Amino acid sequence: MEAAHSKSTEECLAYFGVSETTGLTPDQVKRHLEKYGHNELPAEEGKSLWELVIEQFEDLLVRILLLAACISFVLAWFEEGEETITAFVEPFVILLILIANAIVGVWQERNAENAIEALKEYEPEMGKVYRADRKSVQRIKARDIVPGDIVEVAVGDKVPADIRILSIKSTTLRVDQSILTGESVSVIKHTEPVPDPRAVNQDKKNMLFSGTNIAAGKALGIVATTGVSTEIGKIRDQMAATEQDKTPLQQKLDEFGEQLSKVISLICVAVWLINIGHFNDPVHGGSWIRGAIYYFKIAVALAVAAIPEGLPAVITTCLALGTRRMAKKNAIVRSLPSVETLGCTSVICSDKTGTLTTNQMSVCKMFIIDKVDGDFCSLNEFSITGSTYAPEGEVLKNDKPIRSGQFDGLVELATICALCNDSSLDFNETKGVYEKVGEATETALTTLVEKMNVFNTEVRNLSKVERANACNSVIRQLMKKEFTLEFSRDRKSMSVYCSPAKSSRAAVGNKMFVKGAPEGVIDRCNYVRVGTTRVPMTGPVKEKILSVIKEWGTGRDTLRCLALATRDTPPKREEMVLDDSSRFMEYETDLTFVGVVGMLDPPRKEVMGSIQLCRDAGIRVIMITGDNKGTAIAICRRIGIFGENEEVADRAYTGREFDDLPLAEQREACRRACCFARVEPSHKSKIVEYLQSYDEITAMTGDGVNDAPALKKAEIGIAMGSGTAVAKTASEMVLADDNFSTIVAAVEEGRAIYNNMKQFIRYLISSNVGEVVCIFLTAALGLPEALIPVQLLWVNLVTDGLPATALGFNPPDLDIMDRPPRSPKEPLISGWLFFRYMAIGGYVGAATVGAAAWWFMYAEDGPGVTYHQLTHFMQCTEDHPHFEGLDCEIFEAPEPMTMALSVLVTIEMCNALNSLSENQSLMRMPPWVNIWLLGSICLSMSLHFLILYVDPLPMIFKLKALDLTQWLMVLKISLPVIGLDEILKFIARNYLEG
Ligand SMILES: C/C=C(/C)C(=O)O[C@H]1C(C)=C2[C@H]([C@@H]1OC(=O)CCCCCCC)[C@@](C)(OC(C)=O)C[C@H](OC(=O)CCC)[C@@]1(O)[C@H]2OC(=O)[C@@]1(C)O
Numbered sequence: 001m002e003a004a005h006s007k008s009t010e011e012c013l014a015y016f017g018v019s020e021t022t023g024l025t026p027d028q029v030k031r032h033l034e035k036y037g038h039n040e041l042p043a044e045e046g047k048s049l050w051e052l053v054i055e056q057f058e059d060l061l062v063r064i065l066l067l068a069a070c071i072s073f074v075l076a077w078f079e080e081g082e083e084t085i086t087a088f089v090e091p092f093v094i095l096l097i098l099i100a101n102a103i104v105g106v107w108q109e110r111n112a113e114n115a116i117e118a119l120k121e122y123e124p125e126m127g128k129v130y131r132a133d134r135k136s137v138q139r140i141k142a143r144d145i146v147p148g149d150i151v152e153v154a155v156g157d158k159v160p161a162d163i164r165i166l167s168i169k170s171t172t173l174r175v176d177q178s179i180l181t182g183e184s185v186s187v188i189k190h191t192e193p194v195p196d197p198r199a200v201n202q203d204k205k206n207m208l209f210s211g212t213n214i215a216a217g218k219a220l221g222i223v224a225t226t227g228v229s230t231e232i233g234k235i236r237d238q239m240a241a242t243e244q245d246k247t248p249l250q251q252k253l254d255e256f257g258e259q260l261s262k263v264i265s266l267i268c269v270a271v272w273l274i275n276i277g278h279f280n281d282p283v284h285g286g287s288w289i290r291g292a293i294y295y296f297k298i299a300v301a302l303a304v305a306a307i308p309e310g311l312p313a314v315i316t317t318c319l320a321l322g323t324r325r326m327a328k329k330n331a332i333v334r335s336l337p338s339v340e341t342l343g344c345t346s347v348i349c350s351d352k353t354g355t356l357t358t359n360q361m362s363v364c365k366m367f368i369i370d371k372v373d374g375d376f377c378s379l380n381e382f383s384i385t386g387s388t389y390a391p392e393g394e395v396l397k398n399d400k401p402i403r404s405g406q407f408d409g410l411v412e413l414a415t416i417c418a419l420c421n422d423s424s425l426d427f428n429e430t431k432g433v434y435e436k437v438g439e440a441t442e443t444a445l446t447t448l449v450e451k452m453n454v455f456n457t458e459v460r461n462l463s464k465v466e467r468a469n470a471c472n473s474v475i476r477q478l479m480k481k482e483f484t485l486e487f488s489r490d491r492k493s494m495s496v497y498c499s500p501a502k503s504s505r506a507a508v509g510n511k512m513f514v515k516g517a518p519e520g521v522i523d524r525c526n527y528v529r530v531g532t533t534r535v536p537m538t539g540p541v542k543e544k545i546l547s548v549i550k551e552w553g554t555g556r557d558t559l560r561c562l563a564l565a566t567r568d569t570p571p572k573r574e575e576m577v578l579d580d581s582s583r584f585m586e587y588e589t590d591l592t593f594v595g596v597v598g599m600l601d602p603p604r605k606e607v608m609g610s611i612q613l614c615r616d617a618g619i620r621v622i623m624i625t626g627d628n629k630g631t632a633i634a635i636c637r638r639i640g641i642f643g644e645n646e647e648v649a650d651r652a653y654t655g656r657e658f659d660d661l662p663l664a665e666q667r668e669a670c671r672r673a674c675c676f677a678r679v680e681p682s683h684k685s686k687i688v689e690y691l692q693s694y695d696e697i698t699a700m701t702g703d704g705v706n707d708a709p710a711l712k713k714a715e716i717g718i719a720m721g722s723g724t725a726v727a728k729t730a731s732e733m734v735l736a737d738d739n740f741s742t743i744v745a746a747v748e749e750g751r752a753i754y755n756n757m758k759q760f761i762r763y764l765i766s767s768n769v770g771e772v773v774c775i776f777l778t779a780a781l782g783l784p785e786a787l788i789p790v791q792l793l794w795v796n797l798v799t800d801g802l803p804a805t806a807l808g809f810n811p812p813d814l815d816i817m818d819r820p821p822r823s824p825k826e827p828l829i830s831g832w833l834f835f836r837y838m839a840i841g842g843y844v845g846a847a848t849v850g851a852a853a854w855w856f857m858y859a860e861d862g863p864g865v866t867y868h869q870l871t872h873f874m875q876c877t878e879d880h881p882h883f884e885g886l887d888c889e890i891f892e893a894p895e896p897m898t899m900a901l902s903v904l905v906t907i908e909m910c911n912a913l914n915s916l917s918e919n920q921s922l923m924r925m926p927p928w929v930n931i932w933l934l935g936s937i938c939l940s941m942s943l944h945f946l947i948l949y950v951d952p953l954p955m956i957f958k959l960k961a962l963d964l965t966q967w968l969m970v971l972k973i974s975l976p977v978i979g980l981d982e983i984l985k986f987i988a989r990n991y992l993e994g
């Protein structure tokens with residue numbers, strides 16, 4: 001029964017055909033179970049260990065690599081491991097990488113945490129029902145509860161289903177429902193219907209929501225909805241229906257892999273068509289099986305050359321280290337790839353209280369009526385110092401300090417503040433500061449009362465722990481608080497009914513003290529207090545009171561205002577019914593205005609600057625607040641979201657205004673809006689959707705489980721460190737200190753990170769371009785393998801992987817927050833840069849094949865063949881008494897492969913430095929600029945020598961070291977690559993726009 005809050009207790013009982021005394025019959029439970037299912041959210045999504053690894057191998061590059069391993073493996077068993085038992089080495093290495101990458105997947109997944117699963121923490125194991133088969137109450141499993149059940153809850157109970165309250169057995173029922181409504185304090189429940197079928201949850205005063213807690217009391221209810229139909233259930237389903245898109249880099253890599261298969265596929269065909277002459281060859285006289293093995297030794301080399309096998313390790317280690325750095329700056333990143341999206345944020349939607357502001361409220365201003373005499377009216381306005389909750393401060397009139405007691409209107413103002421107040425103070429000895437007990441707003445009032453000391457209590461001789469509530473306590477001993485009419489939002493006030501306590505001075509009698517939003521309260525005043533006198537409420541006095549309130553709330557003060565008032569002749573006690581807040585407005589009529597208080601919830605100190613950084617970085621900032629629209633706007637002005645004199649008619653909206661627009665104009669509103677006041681959790685999600693319709697990258701804050709769907713949906717959901725576990729698990733990032741400026745500092749890192757990622761991605765991939773060239777020339781010409789997969793893998797995982805991660809530590813651009821957000825569709829390599837790596841790749845694939853061949857042709861220690869057809873090396877076995885007077889195993893020699901492997905290594909070290917900066921020459925941007933980069937390069941070079949010199953490894957790698965001179969040639973060949981990009985860098989700077 002979705003609409004139970006709007007129905008009476010009788011109607012709900014009749015809807016289900018259940019007695020409040022008996023509960024459901026066993027039959028009814030049977031039938032209700034079948035119709036409505038069990039009371040629980042669905043079991044976790046479907047992914048198993050066997051399934052996990054299949055997903056690890058859906059990847060296109062991973063798929064190609066796997067295949068490569070197989071061909072490698074055949075080559076092993078069908079080539080003599082008796083000539084070289086270092087042949088079964090190649091197929092093995094490949095497989096291993098694939099295992100690591102799949103183990104990466106399962107460790108990451110098994111340690112991941114689903115937000116929908118965090119919801120289930122709000123499901124109690126048990127619940128209590130009355131059912132017909134037994135007279136006394138039954139403790140049963142909560143999942144066995146069914147709609148129509150007569151349920152019982154009490155102090156400490158987590159509420160098992162969405163329940164329409166029937167009967168409150170205790171004198172009062174208080175509920176902690178902060179997780180659903182973000183109401184900080186426990187709230188009173190009642191039993192009467194709530195008229196509006198479209199009432200938001202905060203106004204369903206007669207409902208208990210599944211997952212919340214009973215803070216006090218005891219009550220009997222009827223279950224309205226269960227399982228997926230509850231409020232927390234609807235939230236689960238929104239989340240589950242939310243597909244989170246791939247990060248831009250993820251997309252670009254899938255793009256790469258897609259295209260990389262296509263290219264590789266093309267290259268294979270290419271190979272075979274300059275070697276199409278193999279068809280004009282005689283059927284007999286050729287070892288085909290050696291020719292076919294040749295196109296497969298080259299096939300596996302190709303797959304290995306093209307794939308940046310070390311890239312996922314480098315990407316993840318840079319993000320990891322960025323993350324550690326972010327966490328020292330209060331930004332706790334939950335999703336490693338989020339760092340990139342974070343740097344892309346173009347819109348930040350942020351809650352105000354506690355993140356743009358301190359949520360540390362104090363009363364800064366107050367006024368009472370000084371005099372009313374015709375059209376003449378005079379106020380007494382005061383100011384109050386001290387911004388903390390401490391009793392430290394003074395009251396000032398026209399900047400002069402005054403004694404509050406001297407003003408009759410103020411002793412009454414204080415007593416209203418002291419009594420119309422469910423909050424208090426307490427002094428903490430551990431932290432050494434005063435702290436709030438209750439709402440921030442009301443606690444500001446009890447602080448105000450302490451500063452006013454309106455009876456001049458011997459306060460000087462008072463200790464701190466008792467100083468906290470000292471002045472308040474002498475007011476609480478003057479009137480007896482009989483009962484209180486709790487705040488509700490239909491009337492936006494609350495009141496307390498007091499009788500005179502024992503009085504030495506016989507009072508007028510009972511009083512009601514009320515405080516609330518000024519408009520409503522003031523309208524219900526027929527009198528204004530002037531000192532101890534009372535005068536009828538007139539126009540000039542009203543306008544004067546309201547004009548000041550507007551000033552304080554709407555100007556640079558940005559103060560939240562409460563009107564304070566008392567009812568001098570309340571209804572007779574016996575004529576009041578306290579079980580239905582519907583009547584409380586009527587009880588709070590015919591009041592006398594006594595004063596207004598203005599309190600401030602100040603911006604965090606850093607928030608000013610951050611809003612300006614966002615302006616500088618072209619990031620829109622959207623405030624979401626509970627303030628009225630006029631004060632929301634003013635607060636925006638105060639923190640720089642709006643200029644002080646900027647016209648913001650079309651950039652500010654209330655939930656009410658926003659809903660009243662047709663869908664088209666809701667969307668246009670989101671294009672420019674920077675302030676939403678008094679919204680519904682509904683709206684956060686809608687706002688995100690709209691912003692995504694402008695292809696925005698939206699960060700969005702939240703902290704309750706009611707925020708969870710918007711967090712899930714935003715590109716970056718941002719949770720509060722002090723918020724719910726559920727909100728955190730739905731977020732890409734948690735703010736350890738709740739501070740908005742932490743968002744902005746994380747966006748900065750995200751940009752710095754990605755820029756450095758750009759460089760080592762560009763670098764590794766450009767190397768793979770190169771390798772693919774070498775492998776291509778090997779096959780295209782018909783040379784002995786210049787490079788082997790065993791070697792190429794080593795280069796791609798290790799020797800290039802260290803400068804790659806070193807480029808992760810490229811110092812950041814100083815203007816990195818003076819540029820607009822990066823387009824998510826920005827290609828990593830395109831246009832002109834494409835040409836640059838097109839050229840560099842063409843170089844290294846020639847350098848590597850060259851040195852290998854230079855060992856063969858134009859040789860000092862090689863066959864020394866000057867310009868011979870050592871492209872026909874394969875047919876040297878039978879054709880040696882035909883052509884060669886020389887040997888033939890010289891074509892499987894290590895030294896050519898290690899000439900190639902050495903020029904590859906040396907080249908990439910140089911190209912790492914060309915990669916320190918995209919276009920800045922090492923003229924203006926030296927290589928010492930990256931401290932760690934120069935360091936890492938020297939380490940890989942060691943590792944080069946290690947596979948050249950340490951007794952086990954050379955045979956494994958088909959390598960043999962080269963003496964004092966053969967390196968000169970390695971350097972002759974490989975060193976120039978610097979001069980190439982240094983030129984192409986010069987070009988971009990001076991000729992194309994940039
Ligand atoms: C890695 C090895 C190379 C050989 C490769 O195939 O990558 C290609 C391809 C996949 C693209 C190209 C490569 O194409 C070429 O290199 C031209 C053909 C040369 C053939 C080689 C032998 C004849 C990238 C590598 O070329 C340059 C010149 O660097 C740049 C870029 O890659 C990126 O932007 C990096 C993405 C993380 C992509 O054009 C990319 O596809 C597009 O979707 C992008 C945007 O991805």
Ligand SMILES: [K+]
Nearest residue numbers: 711712714717
């Ligand atoms: K999200």
Ligand SMILES: [Mg+2]
Nearest residue numbers: 182703704707
């Ligand atoms: Mg919230």
